[PDB]
Design a protein that fits this description.
This protein is mainly beta. Helix content is about 0%, strand content about 50%. The structure holds the ligand CC[C@@H]1NC(=O)[C@H](CCCNC(=N)NC)NC(=O)[C@](C)(NC(=O)C(C)C)CCNC(=O)[C@@H](c2ccccc2)NC1=O. The site of the ligand CC[C@@H]1NC(=O)[C@H](CCCNC(=N)NC)NC(=O)[C@](C)(NC(=O)C(C)C)CCNC(=O)[C@@H](c2ccccc2)NC1=O has 20 residues, from strand 2, strand 6 and strand 10. It is classed as transcription/inhibitor.
Amino acid sequence: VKPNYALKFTLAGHTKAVSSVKFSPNGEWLASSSADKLIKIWGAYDGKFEKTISGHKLGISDVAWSSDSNLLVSASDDKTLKIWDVSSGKCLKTLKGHSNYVFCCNFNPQSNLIVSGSFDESVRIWDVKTGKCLKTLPAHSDPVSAVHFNRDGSLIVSSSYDGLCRIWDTASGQCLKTLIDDDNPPVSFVKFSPNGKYILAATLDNTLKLWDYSKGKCLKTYTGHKNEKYCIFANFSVTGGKWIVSGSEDNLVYIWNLQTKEIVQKLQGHTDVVISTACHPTENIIASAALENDKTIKLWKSDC
Ligand SMILES: CC[C@@H]1NC(=O)[C@H](CCCNC(=N)NC)NC(=O)[C@](C)(NC(=O)C(C)C)CCNC(=O)[C@@H](c2ccccc2)NC1=O
């Protein structure tokens, strides 16, 4: 079985490189962040432009939705995160504390907490309702490229240019596991699998790896793409066949068979590095976004 993703819509509007795209949990919307300091909201099924959300003072590197699809959180070079009401576009909270670019963000499944990572080498855990920084973890010795909660919010995984992935206990802030392979390339992205049993990590050596973090064992390796410079998002696709999806510095979206590691499809169309991909929660739809020579988001749909 191989998917048959085909281009359905190209979403133009951002005036600079797009940095991150995410589908709302309710499947209705796509949020995009950009170096142009804006967040844009689009219809997930028709690619129709809905609204622009503004307020950050510098470019935005990441955006993420709350579980109820009512809030967004964004991470900016202005050293803050902002929590937004999606319906009104209003900034509800400005999360101050990081001392350098905020690079990555995510809500926990309960959506009472936000986790963030920064070029200041720390991971911060914030209370959504008050905006208070609850914990600052001295997580890494180089910029933090990704942060993600597991399925029940009890763990956080972080990755960094220092070459490590670390697993943290959300409640205590203790580091439960430091993961590394024999070689130490910068880790440019990490996330838990939907079931929370594995982590998928990208390294700046043109490789993605699937790890059983508890055992400290690498189960699968994915290659053939180009990734030595940018922090590119990767995903688990589970609505049809079980795939791994990532962008690439050769301007293509890569799709691999998770179990066999074989490349099953490469999506052509972007005119610059595909920095971000996202998978729709209920349909076989991928959103991809690209850098400065492209500035567009593309929506692709498959039968599996
Ligand atoms: C979207 C532009 C692109 N930005 C980046 O690649 C990253 C964000 C990557 C996407 N986000 C994530 N992976 N978050 C989990 N941010 C960054 O890098 C920083 C932190 N911030 C921005 O860029 C904002 C202006 C958005 C730093 C400045 N940008 C850059 O210097 C430039 C670059 C050029 C060469 C190599 C790497 C990155 N990035 C770029 O050309």
